[PDB]
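User: Can you write out an input/output pair for a complex, sequences first and structure second?

Assistant: Here is one pair. Inputs:
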Amino acid sequence: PGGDFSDPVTSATLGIVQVFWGLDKKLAQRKHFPSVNWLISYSKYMRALDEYYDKHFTEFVPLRTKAKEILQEEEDLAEIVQLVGKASLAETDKITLEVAKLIKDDFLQQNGYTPYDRFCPFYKTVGMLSNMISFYDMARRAVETTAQSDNKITWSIIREHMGEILYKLSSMKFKDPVKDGEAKIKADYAQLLEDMQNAFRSL
Amino acid sequence: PGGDFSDPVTSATLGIVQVFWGLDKKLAQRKHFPSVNWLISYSKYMRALDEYYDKHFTEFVPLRTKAKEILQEEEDLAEIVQLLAETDKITLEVAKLIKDDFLQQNGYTPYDRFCPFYKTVGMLSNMISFYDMARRAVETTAITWSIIREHMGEILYKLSSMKFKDPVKDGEAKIKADYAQLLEDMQNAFRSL
Amino acid sequence: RGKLIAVIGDEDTVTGFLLGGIGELNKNRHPNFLVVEKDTTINEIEDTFRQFLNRDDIGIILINQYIAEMVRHALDAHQRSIPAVLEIPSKEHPYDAAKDSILRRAKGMF
Amino acid sequence: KDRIEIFPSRMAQTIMKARLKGAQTGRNLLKKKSDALTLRFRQILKKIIETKMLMGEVMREAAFSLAEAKFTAGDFSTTVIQNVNKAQVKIRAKKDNVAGVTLPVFEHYHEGTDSYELTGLARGGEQLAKLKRNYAKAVELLVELASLQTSFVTLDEAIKITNRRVNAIEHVIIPRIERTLAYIITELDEREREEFYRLKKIQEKKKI
């Protein structure tokens, strides 16, 4: 009742179940349909699955880890944004904010009624995550290398230089599973990664 | 109890007991056992005992009031500090020293297992005379607080370390003499401030 | 004592102000001023302005109006308390009465 | 996040009431400080444009005296510009703590190096002395204006910071506290009602 988590029903329920998926109404009110509160949800089956990944998706294991810390740092910075405006943060903080925004906008949003997103195969998801973390790695490396340079790069310079690539990153998820082979999707993602590497080399 | 102030036992007890002392809101330091809660900490025997005090100790008579003045002034200004003149800083640092030294008695060590009233009188006189001649202005009397601290850091350490004079082996005379020497050092620092 | 006032103006302003009481050569034999002429271009005005900005012992900068318009971007981009830049017209140039950044940052004026 | 995370209890209520009072008083003092800074802001802004008109008038007077000296002498300017040795007027950095923050201002510190006897260009010494006096007055006025606007800069920066802080305290913390207090009152009411129902039931059964 009331959307609160103090009633005895949920209190008793959480004492038994091993994995919990809290839903936040605020996300639902802003049309973020898979309204999952990543800040409070927790799964106890993080163990006993590392071997499955070792034999299928070994590369995937650290990716989600990195995603968790970037979201956590976004949360820790969000209140400092709320009470203190921008232009008081380093470039690493701003690019991390941008990466979190991209994660929320694309990796988290899923519309189950569209043909292109009614169901997400796993390979699509891991490819997306690899692309995003590769972007974050390259951007952080670029800004930290030029941190001590007389021509230190700022977020605006990066955004203008490769904004079309950001559109491509947002739009990669508009691919069907049917009428589109897995090889085609993987090739497109690798091609986008290569474009990103070229854009970072040019700087 | 969980409801310290709201416990019916406490409410009935405050309606009868002549003299009461209590803990403040549960501080970050769970080992702050000798605390004080100015909201409800009081006594009802000052009237029937001032005549006795006058024949033994008389310096404390304004000092006991002044300590309360200082503490309540700090309590008023603390929430504003959390959310800034130098005299405010002098007040709050003195109050912090008072809480750190005068309060937070150990008990389980000999040097604070027992304290004769004279030891308390001496240490409190020094600790409060620090403020009585530092609040007369932002300067020594009518700079800033940071200048005072940078000038007299050793003085603050010695003020803090008054506590360790064990009454068991050190008699009253020796502890009084040490405190008086420290007071003279404070006076010398005031003259050079 | 601590700071030395700089001047950047046409010949009459410079010669008038040098007799006025100011002007100096440091130990490095470098003018704390500059005489502008019709042949002067923008880049060296900008360079001397920046050199003065980095020079700790400038304090106050007096520049002509039209010179300020030549390097208006240098003025607007740079925002600090120490370099007190001013605006003064020359004899033939009309009165300066607007487009002063110090008035611009206080928009609520007339 | 709209509700401060704390379990309902009477001491939660007391603590939140105390925090509400403290926040209100702090907001009042911060608004006061902003008001005082804005008062100073307006007061020093009473005249910069008028000092600018005075600067213009003095400068034109100096220029006219310079023209007269040019008629008297002709080509002193080259001599003046070539021979520059030591400054006879320098500037003393100064501070004026008019509020919680310190403002930068300056002083016309007459260092006092001897002037230059220019006795070569037909020797219009009257003209040169008059020119020196007029430009000295111009320099003093300009130093005054420089100090004024230099303090003004730091003043308006502090003002904007304080106003931003005032808005932050007003539009965030207080609504959260009020919502938390209402929620706490509701929960305590629920507990009391439930106890009342238990007591009613036990009396009902006891009636047998």
